[PDB]
Design brief:
It is built from 11 helices and 11 strands. Strands 3-2-1-4-5-11-10 form a 7-stranded mixed sheet, with helices on both faces. The longest helix is centred in the first third of the chain and has 20 residues. The radius of gyration is 19 Å and the shape is globular. The structure holds guanosine-5'-triphosphate (GTP), sinefungin and sodium ion (5 copies). It is classed as transferase. Keywords: methyltransferase, mrna, CAP, sinefungin, GTP, K. lactis.
Length: 288
Amino acid sequence: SPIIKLRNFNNAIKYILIDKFTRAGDVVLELACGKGGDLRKYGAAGISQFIGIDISNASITEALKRYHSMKNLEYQVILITGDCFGESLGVAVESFPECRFPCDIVSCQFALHYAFETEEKARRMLLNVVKSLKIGGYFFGTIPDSEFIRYKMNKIPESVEKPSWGNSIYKVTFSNNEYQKNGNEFPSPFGQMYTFWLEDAIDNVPEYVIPFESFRSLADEYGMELELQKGFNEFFVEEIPNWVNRFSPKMREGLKRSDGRYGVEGVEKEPAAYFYTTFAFRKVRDYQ
Ligand SMILES: Nc1nc2c(ncn2[C@@H]2O[C@H](COP(=O)(O)OP(=O)(O)OP(=O)(O)O)[C@@H](O)[C@H]2O)c(=O)[nH]1
Ligand SMILES: Nc1ncnc2c1ncn2[C@@H]1O[C@H](C[C@@H](N)CC[C@H](N)C(=O)O)[C@@H](O)[C@H]1O
Ligand code: NA
Ligand code: NA
Ligand code: NA
Ligand code: NA
Ligand code: NA
């Protein structure tokens, strides 16, 4: 399946990204952890403690069910329902004093753009990140790539009321064309909504652009400086040599293309390799 190949590729991206920044003994806070599908990736990195928070009780229930079916684990796991973006994290974690804060790593996969609903939420998310992180610690994850979004939008005429593009397995549909009416610039970095469909994965969910320059400038205000901004394709090309043989046999065969090399080809290439970017920052100073 194109979708199976996409899932395997993005799973590989996460393995690589987690390993790149997470070191043995680290304490990890995972924001918007969903159903907690990356635990084994953090275990491979040798962490000491994992704290996962998600706003969905149904997702946390599933993550706890997945956790409790694991065995011989060498790290502690805390899984919590709470709002990571609209409220202070202290609300979510107060009844879990076993959390070891500040932590060494904050991660967030396929979710941070929901914090760009408004400026207030973007700032609250960043304040939660930096208050949780030690000086010198890292914040990393995976988001839709505003630069690829802008490329596509720059090819859409102003006559289109709901700018849209896609292929047989994915589709983006913007709520409005204010980008096009405003000289190919969003009227605000925040709240710029589009619905995202990905076959058998994402059911037309509204989400928000995360303009990378605004994310970066806000992060700097809160004391975090840029470490990584490579799109999935470039990231994979650069890192796969060190990993081709680190991956499970099943993940490796899944990554093999028809020409015998590694990556994605075919219809899944655009959504898997171009639509998303990695990000990482380092906390370099305390924020008042
Ligand atoms: N644009 C966008 N894509 C997302 C979002 N969440 C997930 N994705 C995409 O959907 C893929 C995940 O497909 P799933 O079927 O959810 O697989 P999974 O995350 O491995 O499985 P679970 O642990 O059960 O959640 C990701 O690799 C991304 O391509 C999102 O909020 N926005
Ligand atoms: N304000 C919020 N605080 C915490 N989690 C949120 C918030 N808004 C959305 N989410 C979660 O963000 C997640 C988005 C998912 N696309 C990604 C989940 C997970 N990281 C994964 O990669 O599978 C969901 O699990 C949502 O419930
Ligand atoms: Na972006
Ligand atoms: Na819009
Ligand atoms: Na936006
Ligand atoms: Na986005
Ligand atoms: Na920055």
